[PDB]
mmCIF file of C-alpha atoms in Angstrom:
data_model
loop_
_atom_site.group_PDB
_atom_site.id
_atom_site.type_symbol
_atom_site.label_atom_id
_atom_site.label_comp_id
_atom_site.label_asym_id
_atom_site.label_seq_id
_atom_site.Cartn_x
_atom_site.Cartn_y
_atom_site.Cartn_z
ATOM 1 C CA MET A 1 -2.586 -0.202 -21.735
ATOM 2 C CA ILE A 2 -1.642 1.835 -18.564
ATOM 3 C CA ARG A 3 -3.446 3.554 -15.654
ATOM 4 C CA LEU A 4 -1.545 5.796 -13.150
ATOM 5 C CA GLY A 5 -1.528 6.601 -9.444
ATOM 6 C CA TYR A 6 0.604 8.001 -6.618
ATOM 7 C CA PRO A 7 0.622 7.501 -2.874
ATOM 8 C CA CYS A 8 -0.564 9.209 0.345
ATOM 9 C CA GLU A 9 -0.405 12.860 -0.497
ATOM 10 C CA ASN A 10 -0.519 15.386 -3.240
ATOM 11 C CA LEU A 11 2.049 18.161 -3.415
ATOM 12 C CA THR A 12 0.405 20.696 -5.620
ATOM 13 C CA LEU A 13 -2.678 20.590 -3.351
ATOM 14 C CA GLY A 14 -0.696 20.382 -0.185
ATOM 15 C CA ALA A 15 -3.258 17.640 0.688
ATOM 16 C CA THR A 16 -2.283 14.571 2.758
ATOM 17 C CA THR A 17 -4.120 11.522 4.136
ATOM 18 C CA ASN A 18 -1.253 10.781 6.480
ATOM 19 C CA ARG A 19 -1.259 13.231 9.446
ATOM 20 C CA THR A 20 -0.583 11.705 12.861
ATOM 21 C CA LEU A 21 -0.248 13.040 16.424
ATOM 22 C CA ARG A 22 2.738 12.998 18.791
ATOM 23 C CA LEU A 23 1.900 15.005 21.924
ATOM 24 C CA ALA A 24 1.168 13.036 25.107
ATOM 25 C CA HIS A 25 -2.245 12.088 26.539
ATOM 26 C CA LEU A 26 -4.175 12.645 23.341
ATOM 27 C CA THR A 27 -7.881 13.285 23.686
ATOM 28 C CA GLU A 28 -10.740 11.836 21.649
ATOM 29 C CA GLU A 29 -11.388 15.384 20.345
ATOM 30 C CA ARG A 30 -7.768 15.968 19.136
ATOM 31 C CA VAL A 31 -7.832 12.602 17.318
ATOM 32 C CA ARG A 32 -11.211 13.416 15.679
ATOM 33 C CA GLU A 33 -9.859 16.751 14.287
ATOM 34 C CA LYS A 34 -6.811 15.020 12.741
ATOM 35 C CA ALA A 35 -8.972 12.279 11.217
ATOM 36 C CA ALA A 36 -11.336 14.995 9.863
ATOM 37 C CA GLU A 37 -8.411 16.805 8.139
ATOM 38 C CA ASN A 38 -7.114 13.486 6.585
ATOM 39 C CA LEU A 39 -10.654 12.580 5.411
ATOM 40 C CA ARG A 40 -11.230 16.061 3.875
ATOM 41 C CA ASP A 41 -7.885 15.740 2.057
ATOM 42 C CA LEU A 42 -8.766 12.266 0.759
ATOM 43 C CA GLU A 43 -11.861 13.833 -0.836
ATOM 44 C CA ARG A 44 -9.698 16.662 -2.323
ATOM 45 C CA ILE A 45 -7.331 14.058 -3.811
ATOM 46 C CA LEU A 46 -10.090 11.850 -5.354
ATOM 47 C CA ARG A 47 -11.593 14.944 -7.023
ATOM 48 C CA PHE A 48 -8.166 16.138 -8.184
ATOM 49 C CA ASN A 49 -7.465 12.693 -9.669
ATOM 50 C CA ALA A 50 -10.776 12.672 -11.613
ATOM 51 C CA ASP A 51 -9.612 15.877 -13.289
ATOM 52 C CA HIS A 52 -5.943 15.088 -13.821
ATOM 53 C CA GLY A 53 -5.894 11.601 -15.364
ATOM 54 C CA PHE A 54 -5.002 9.488 -12.295
ATOM 55 C CA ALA A 55 -7.002 6.356 -11.601
ATOM 56 C CA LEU A 56 -5.100 5.079 -8.571
ATOM 57 C CA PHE A 57 -4.389 6.289 -5.072
ATOM 58 C CA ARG A 58 -2.766 4.741 -2.012
ATOM 59 C CA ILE A 59 -4.419 5.934 1.204
ATOM 60 C CA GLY A 60 -1.978 6.699 4.091
ATOM 61 C CA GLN A 61 -2.006 4.263 7.067
ATOM 62 C CA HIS A 62 -2.576 7.288 9.325
ATOM 63 C CA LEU A 63 -5.936 8.258 7.780
ATOM 64 C CA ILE A 64 -7.648 7.518 11.128
ATOM 65 C CA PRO A 65 -4.610 8.030 13.408
ATOM 66 C CA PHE A 66 -3.843 4.992 15.698
ATOM 67 C CA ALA A 67 -7.083 3.311 14.661
ATOM 68 C CA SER A 68 -5.629 -0.229 15.173
ATOM 69 C CA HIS A 69 -4.341 0.526 18.747
ATOM 70 C CA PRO A 70 -6.228 -0.767 21.850
ATOM 71 C CA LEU A 71 -6.225 2.770 23.288
ATOM 72 C CA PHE A 72 -8.022 4.287 20.259
ATOM 73 C CA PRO A 73 -10.604 6.161 22.283
ATOM 74 C CA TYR A 74 -13.890 5.845 20.271
ATOM 75 C CA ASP A 75 -15.626 3.616 17.748
ATOM 76 C CA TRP A 76 -14.022 4.843 14.500
ATOM 77 C CA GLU A 77 -16.043 2.437 12.275
ATOM 78 C CA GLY A 78 -19.314 3.815 13.695
ATOM 79 C CA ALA A 79 -18.083 7.391 13.679
ATOM 80 C CA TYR A 80 -16.893 7.188 10.009
ATOM 81 C CA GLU A 81 -19.088 4.593 8.254
ATOM 82 C CA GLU A 82 -21.350 7.205 6.578
ATOM 83 C CA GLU A 83 -18.383 9.463 5.568
ATOM 84 C CA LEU A 84 -16.382 6.461 4.343
ATOM 85 C CA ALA A 85 -19.373 5.258 2.326
ATOM 86 C CA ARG A 86 -19.651 8.613 0.625
ATOM 87 C CA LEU A 87 -15.904 8.869 -0.030
ATOM 88 C CA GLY A 88 -15.979 5.268 -1.395
ATOM 89 C CA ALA A 89 -18.962 6.218 -3.622
ATOM 90 C CA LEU A 90 -16.958 9.172 -5.026
ATOM 91 C CA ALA A 91 -13.945 6.930 -5.733
ATOM 92 C CA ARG A 92 -16.158 4.424 -7.602
ATOM 93 C CA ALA A 93 -17.928 7.274 -9.580
ATOM 94 C CA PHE A 94 -14.493 8.636 -10.480
ATOM 95 C CA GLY A 95 -13.298 5.099 -11.407
ATOM 96 C CA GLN A 96 -10.417 5.314 -8.817
ATOM 97 C CA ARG A 97 -8.816 2.145 -7.479
ATOM 98 C CA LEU A 98 -7.732 2.385 -3.847
ATOM 99 C CA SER A 99 -4.878 0.733 -1.942
ATOM 100 C CA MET A 100 -2.936 0.666 1.348
ATOM 101 C CA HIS A 101 0.616 -0.406 2.083
ATOM 102 C CA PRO A 102 1.278 -0.896 5.847
ATOM 103 C CA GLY A 103 4.610 0.019 7.471
ATOM 104 C CA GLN A 104 7.863 -2.027 7.051
ATOM 105 C CA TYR A 105 7.263 -3.018 10.699
ATOM 106 C CA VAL A 106 3.903 -4.856 10.039
ATOM 107 C CA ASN A 107 5.300 -8.319 10.209
ATOM 108 C CA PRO A 108 2.799 -11.196 10.416
ATOM 109 C CA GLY A 109 5.659 -13.790 10.164
ATOM 110 C CA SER A 110 7.650 -12.322 13.081
ATOM 111 C CA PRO A 111 8.891 -14.857 15.654
ATOM 112 C CA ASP A 112 7.648 -12.508 18.343
ATOM 113 C CA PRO A 113 3.948 -12.885 19.381
ATOM 114 C CA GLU A 114 3.594 -9.183 20.292
ATOM 115 C CA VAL A 115 4.868 -8.073 16.823
ATOM 116 C CA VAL A 116 2.504 -10.531 15.150
ATOM 117 C CA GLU A 117 -0.403 -9.238 17.287
ATOM 118 C CA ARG A 118 0.279 -5.554 16.475
ATOM 119 C CA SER A 119 0.766 -6.453 12.793
ATOM 120 C CA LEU A 120 -2.524 -8.343 12.431
ATOM 121 C CA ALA A 121 -4.422 -5.513 14.222
ATOM 122 C CA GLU A 122 -2.991 -2.998 11.656
ATOM 123 C CA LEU A 123 -3.895 -5.257 8.708
ATOM 124 C CA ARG A 124 -7.424 -5.791 10.109
ATOM 125 C CA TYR A 125 -7.884 -2.027 10.374
ATOM 126 C CA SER A 126 -6.600 -1.502 6.823
ATOM 127 C CA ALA A 127 -8.896 -4.232 5.417
ATOM 128 C CA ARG A 128 -11.845 -2.905 7.397
ATOM 129 C CA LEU A 129 -11.216 0.581 5.998
ATOM 130 C CA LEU A 130 -11.174 -0.724 2.418
ATOM 131 C CA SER A 131 -14.502 -2.575 3.181
ATOM 132 C CA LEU A 132 -16.080 0.536 4.601
ATOM 133 C CA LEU A 133 -15.028 2.455 1.451
ATOM 134 C CA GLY A 134 -16.644 -0.372 -0.603
ATOM 135 C CA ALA A 135 -13.303 -0.772 -2.428
ATOM 136 C CA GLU A 136 -14.005 -4.009 -4.328
ATOM 137 C CA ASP A 137 -10.772 -4.002 -6.512
ATOM 138 C CA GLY A 138 -8.939 -2.510 -3.471
ATOM 139 C CA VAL A 139 -5.506 -3.826 -2.582
ATOM 140 C CA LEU A 140 -3.609 -4.186 0.705
ATOM 141 C CA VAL A 141 0.078 -4.585 -0.320
ATOM 142 C CA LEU A 142 2.479 -6.356 2.054
ATOM 143 C CA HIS A 143 6.190 -7.345 2.035
ATOM 144 C CA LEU A 144 7.240 -10.795 3.369
ATOM 145 C CA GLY A 145 9.325 -9.066 6.050
ATOM 146 C CA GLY A 146 12.364 -10.205 8.090
ATOM 147 C CA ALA A 147 14.223 -13.520 7.758
ATOM 148 C CA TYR A 148 15.657 -13.702 11.333
ATOM 149 C CA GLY A 149 18.043 -16.404 10.047
ATOM 150 C CA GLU A 150 15.356 -19.050 9.710
ATOM 151 C CA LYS A 151 14.041 -18.052 6.235
ATOM 152 C CA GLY A 152 11.887 -21.108 5.365
ATOM 153 C CA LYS A 153 10.293 -21.037 8.837
ATOM 154 C CA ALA A 154 9.733 -17.285 8.539
ATOM 155 C CA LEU A 155 7.720 -17.769 5.346
ATOM 156 C CA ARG A 156 5.898 -20.620 7.093
ATOM 157 C CA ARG A 157 4.979 -18.366 10.088
ATOM 158 C CA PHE A 158 3.806 -15.606 7.688
ATOM 159 C CA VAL A 159 1.489 -17.950 5.734
ATOM 160 C CA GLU A 160 0.179 -19.585 8.945
ATOM 161 C CA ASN A 161 -0.603 -16.281 10.693
ATOM 162 C CA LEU A 162 -2.466 -14.877 7.639
ATOM 163 C CA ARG A 163 -4.310 -17.862 6.336
ATOM 164 C CA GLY A 164 -7.266 -17.444 8.847
ATOM 165 C CA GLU A 165 -7.558 -13.664 8.173
ATOM 166 C CA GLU A 166 -10.620 -13.689 5.876
ATOM 167 C CA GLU A 167 -11.191 -9.953 5.522
ATOM 168 C CA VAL A 168 -7.425 -9.182 5.066
ATOM 169 C CA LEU A 169 -7.248 -11.930 2.427
ATOM 170 C CA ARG A 170 -9.975 -10.234 0.407
ATOM 171 C CA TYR A 171 -7.563 -7.410 -0.502
ATOM 172 C CA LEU A 172 -4.070 -8.759 0.317
ATOM 173 C CA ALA A 173 -1.402 -8.767 -2.455
ATOM 174 C CA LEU A 174 2.286 -9.595 -1.803
ATOM 175 C CA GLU A 175 5.287 -7.540 -3.003
ATOM 176 C CA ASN A 176 8.961 -8.366 -3.715
ATOM 177 C CA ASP A 177 11.538 -6.311 -1.753
ATOM 178 C CA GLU A 178 15.123 -5.131 -2.378
ATOM 179 C CA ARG A 179 16.928 -7.352 0.127
ATOM 180 C CA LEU A 180 15.170 -10.539 1.223
ATOM 181 C CA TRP A 181 12.392 -11.789 -1.056
ATOM 182 C CA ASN A 182 12.547 -11.805 -4.877
ATOM 183 C CA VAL A 183 9.612 -12.207 -7.238
ATOM 184 C CA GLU A 184 10.086 -15.958 -7.530
ATOM 185 C CA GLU A 185 9.987 -16.366 -3.718
ATOM 186 C CA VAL A 186 6.975 -14.107 -3.329
ATOM 187 C CA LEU A 187 5.190 -16.036 -6.092
ATOM 188 C CA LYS A 188 5.469 -19.134 -3.917
ATOM 189 C CA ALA A 189 4.055 -17.397 -0.837
ATOM 190 C CA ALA A 190 1.254 -15.771 -2.898
ATOM 191 C CA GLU A 191 0.224 -19.198 -4.220
ATOM 192 C CA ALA A 192 0.090 -20.623 -0.672
ATOM 193 C CA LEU A 193 -2.242 -17.808 0.470
ATOM 194 C CA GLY A 194 -4.180 -17.602 -2.849
ATOM 195 C CA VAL A 195 -3.411 -13.876 -3.382
ATOM 196 C CA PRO A 196 -1.894 -11.761 -6.184
ATOM 197 C CA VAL A 197 1.662 -10.530 -6.637
ATOM 198 C CA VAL A 198 2.643 -6.891 -7.020
ATOM 199 C CA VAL A 199 6.003 -6.450 -8.773
ATOM 200 C CA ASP A 200 8.007 -3.460 -7.619
ATOM 201 C CA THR A 201 10.366 -2.645 -10.552
ATOM 202 C CA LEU A 202 13.104 -1.005 -8.498
ATOM 203 C CA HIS A 203 13.080 -3.799 -5.866
ATOM 204 C CA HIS A 204 13.271 -6.282 -8.728
ATOM 205 C CA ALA A 205 16.314 -4.477 -10.280
ATOM 206 C CA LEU A 206 18.051 -4.480 -6.864
ATOM 207 C CA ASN A 207 17.050 -8.076 -6.052
ATOM 208 C CA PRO A 208 16.102 -9.900 -9.275
ATOM 209 C CA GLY A 209 16.855 -13.553 -8.457
ATOM 210 C CA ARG A 210 17.048 -15.370 -11.784
ATOM 211 C CA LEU A 211 14.219 -13.520 -13.552
ATOM 212 C CA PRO A 212 14.363 -10.691 -16.090
ATOM 213 C CA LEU A 213 11.699 -8.037 -15.372
ATOM 214 C CA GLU A 214 9.696 -9.161 -18.398
ATOM 215 C CA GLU A 215 9.596 -12.718 -17.020
ATOM 216 C CA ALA A 216 8.677 -11.517 -13.475
ATOM 217 C CA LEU A 217 5.723 -9.592 -14.910
ATOM 218 C CA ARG A 218 4.667 -12.455 -17.138
ATOM 219 C CA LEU A 219 4.505 -14.712 -14.082
ATOM 220 C CA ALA A 220 2.911 -12.242 -11.715
ATOM 221 C CA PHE A 221 0.198 -10.930 -14.065
ATOM 222 C CA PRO A 222 -1.900 -14.150 -14.116
ATOM 223 C CA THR A 223 -2.123 -14.038 -10.261
ATOM 224 C CA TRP A 224 -4.701 -11.204 -10.615
ATOM 225 C CA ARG A 225 -8.484 -11.626 -11.057
ATOM 226 C CA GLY A 226 -8.709 -7.902 -11.944
ATOM 227 C CA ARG A 227 -6.120 -5.603 -13.610
ATOM 228 C CA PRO A 228 -2.517 -6.412 -12.505
ATOM 229 C CA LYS A 229 -0.677 -3.840 -10.363
ATOM 230 C CA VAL A 230 2.936 -2.798 -10.642
ATOM 231 C CA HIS A 231 4.984 -0.372 -8.499
ATOM 232 C CA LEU A 232 7.356 1.885 -10.487
ATOM 233 C CA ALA A 233 10.129 3.911 -8.778
ATOM 234 C CA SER A 234 13.577 5.169 -9.716
ATOM 235 C CA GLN A 235 16.663 4.778 -7.586
ATOM 236 C CA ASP A 236 17.833 8.057 -6.063
ATOM 237 C CA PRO A 237 21.325 8.668 -7.476
ATOM 238 C CA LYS A 238 22.554 10.080 -4.165
ATOM 239 C CA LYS A 239 20.922 7.853 -1.521
ATOM 240 C CA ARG A 240 21.026 4.325 -0.221
ATOM 241 C CA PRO A 241 19.847 1.383 -2.301
ATOM 242 C CA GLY A 242 16.092 1.397 -2.634
ATOM 243 C CA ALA A 243 15.622 5.081 -1.779
ATOM 244 C CA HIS A 244 13.187 6.687 -4.305
ATOM 245 C CA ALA A 245 14.141 9.556 -6.597
ATOM 246 C CA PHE A 246 12.004 12.708 -6.730
ATOM 247 C CA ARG A 247 10.870 11.690 -10.194
ATOM 248 C CA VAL A 248 10.769 8.431 -12.176
ATOM 249 C CA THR A 249 13.294 8.510 -15.050
ATOM 250 C CA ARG A 250 12.401 8.214 -18.746
ATOM 251 C CA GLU A 251 14.645 5.143 -18.787
ATOM 252 C CA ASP A 252 12.770 3.277 -16.035
ATOM 253 C CA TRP A 253 9.390 4.206 -17.558
ATOM 254 C CA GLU A 254 10.519 2.878 -20.926
ATOM 255 C CA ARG A 255 11.987 -0.259 -19.352
ATOM 256 C CA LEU A 256 8.638 -1.077 -17.716
ATOM 257 C CA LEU A 257 6.601 -0.246 -20.803
ATOM 258 C CA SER A 258 8.791 -2.545 -22.865
ATOM 259 C CA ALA A 259 8.597 -5.364 -20.269
ATOM 260 C CA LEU A 260 4.776 -5.312 -19.942
ATOM 261 C CA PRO A 261 2.916 -8.456 -21.147
ATOM 262 C CA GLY A 262 -0.425 -6.577 -21.100
ATOM 263 C CA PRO A 263 -2.483 -3.687 -19.538
ATOM 264 C CA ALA A 264 -1.516 -2.736 -15.976
ATOM 265 C CA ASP A 265 -2.242 -0.255 -13.207
ATOM 266 C CA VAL A 266 1.023 1.495 -12.353
ATOM 267 C CA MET A 267 1.501 2.977 -8.903
ATOM 268 C CA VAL A 268 4.235 5.586 -9.237
ATOM 269 C CA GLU A 269 6.360 5.785 -6.090
ATOM 270 C CA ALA A 270 8.457 8.933 -6.169
ATOM 271 C CA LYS A 271 9.171 11.828 -3.788
ATOM 272 C CA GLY A 272 7.403 14.228 -6.171
ATOM 273 C CA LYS A 273 4.110 12.280 -5.711
ATOM 274 C CA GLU A 274 1.709 13.351 -8.550
ATOM 275 C CA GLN A 275 4.725 15.374 -9.874
ATOM 276 C CA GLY A 276 6.790 12.174 -9.788
ATOM 277 C CA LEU A 277 6.002 11.192 -13.357
#
């Protein structure tokens, strides 16, 4: 019925795939050491998951820090192809399903050519990384992003800018968000691009449109060739709308389990990570 996962890092290990660098004038060697630490921790996390009943993991965008930037100082695909092949082999042997979820700021439908350009470079890196890991059921999850007034044209720019992106499209799935795009709207975009829909339960509660959760899931599930994916989070009782609690509540778990039309892979999004259950 259900498989489970968590994103980016693991708290009990103190392992993370998401280290970056801030100091000025970075050197190739400083970047390589940070990438090495993120890669070693990805291995630690795959092995931990094999042992602890987790089949899913979202890799941090920073795994190879600044890999999509023009200034990235060496050929990361060449440097890491052998290591990524081995890590991908481990993930397949452990039956783990891998994903990435680019920043809020990756915005292929932006009216600004420089934002679109940065955004597509980040998606191409993410999709290339999943290919190098040999992540066949791998997913690259994306929001529909800003409206900028112009909400029909925004969705039009998004579809247009992505439709030629063959490698991105191999893994791309679209997600509803808490403010701008509900499941019904995202369904329409997903259809245009020929990709699946990931329902985020908390975003759906915050921004449901005219669909009950059970109906959202019933409509989104057939958009998958493989097992459908759902994102489960709980609203933090003290923070702004959409902020995740440290752990998912029994109530929200039970609400999803009741709503489910069939088997699903559930990505748990909580501050407690693997402790977020």
